[PDB]
Amino acid sequence: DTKEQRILRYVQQNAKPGDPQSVLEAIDTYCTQKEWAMNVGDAKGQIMDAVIREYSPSLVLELGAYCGYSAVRMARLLQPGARLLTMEMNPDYAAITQQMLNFAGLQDKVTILNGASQDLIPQLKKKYDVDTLDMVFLDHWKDRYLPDTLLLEKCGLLRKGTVLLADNVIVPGTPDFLAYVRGSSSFECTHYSSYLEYMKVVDGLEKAIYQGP
Numbered sequence: 205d206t207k208e209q210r211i212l213r214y215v216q217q218n219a220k221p222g223d224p225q226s227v228l229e230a231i232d233t234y235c236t237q238k239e240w241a242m243n244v245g246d247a248k249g250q251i252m253d254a255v256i257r258e259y260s261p262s263l264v265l266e267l268g269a270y271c272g273y274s275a276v277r278m279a280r281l282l283q284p285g286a287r288l289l290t291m292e293m294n295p296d297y298a299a300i301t302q303q304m305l306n307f308a309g310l311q312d313k314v315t316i317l318n319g320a321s322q323d324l325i326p327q328l329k330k331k332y333d334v335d336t337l338d339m340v341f342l343d344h345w346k347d348r349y350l351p352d353t354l355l356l357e358k359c360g361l362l363r364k365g366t367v368l369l370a371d372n373v374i375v376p377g378t379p380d381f382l383a384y385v386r387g388s389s390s391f392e393c394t395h396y397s398s399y400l401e402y403m404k405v406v407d408g409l410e411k412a413i414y415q416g417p
């Protein structure tokens with residue numbers, strides 16, 4: 205089997221069904237003690253939790269689901285009626301994410317989009333009944349952060365106050381995205397310095413709040 209299947213099996217065998225917090229702790233436990241994996245982790249996840257609780261977004265878009273750790277982390281804090289849409293181009297990973305969300309009891313809150321973000325972003329308004337996004341979590345391939353941010357703006361998916369939260373802006377790093385949002389008056393930026401998941405390597409999240417054209 206794969207590492208992603210072993211993570212899901214550990215959750216199914218150790219986490220409590222319908223308990224998102226228990227599912228998160230099981231994923232973090234397995235990857236801390238057995239196999240490292242690119243989940244956002246508990247250190248940066250706690251910063252994510254605080255950002256989510258401050259802005260209380262009604263519609264969240266996630267770029268990169270992997271095994272569903274970040275989707276479980278964000279969906280467990282959403283108000284009733286709020287929605288999370290997550291895009292995952294790997295079908296093997298998205299099948300794991302769906303089973304992870306089902307186990308945590310959050311399937312009614314999260315919708316998985318199978319495909320590449322650059323192909324799915326232009327179809328959000330028509331196919332998934334989206335006006336503008338309240339929050340965007342960027343966590344896919346690092347070279348897509350900036351072009352997808354420009355694509356989200358072109359398709360009219362950003363409004364004044366839309367919160368962009370970017371992972372891995374230090375390690376592995378997103379230099380072009382970081383330089384663009386920090387240099388553009390369209391984005392007010394705040395850096396939250398933390399640590400790479402399950403490690404003591406320095407990383408951080410960048411919050412970029414859209415201010416308009």
Ligand SMILES: Cc1c(Cl)c(C)[n+]([O-])c(Cl)c1-c1noc(-c2cc(O)c(O)c([N+](=O)[O-])c2)n1
Pocket residue numbers: 242243244268343344345346371372375376401403405
């Ligand atoms: C593990 C590691 C170590 Cl020990 C060192 C020293 N360095 O330099 C790097 Cl770069 C890595 C590293 N490899 O992959 C990732 C990573 C993390 C994500 O959170 C993420 O989302 C994605 N991703 O591909 O989406 C990738 N990090």
Ligand SMILES: Nc1ncnc2c1ncn2[C@@H]1O[C@H](CSCC[C@H](N)C(=O)O)[C@@H](O)[C@H]1O
Pocket residue numbers: 242243244245267268269270271272273274275291292293294297319320321322343344345348
């Ligand atoms: N262009 C793209 N469109 C959609 N998904 C992409 C993508 N490029 C990479 N990805 C996916 O994004 C994932 C990044 S790992 C992200 C982990 C997750 N956000 C968490 O914290 O738990 C990978 O699984 C990869 O398959």
Ligand SMILES: [Mg+2]
Pocket residue numbers: 242243244343371372
């Ligand atoms: Mg990441």
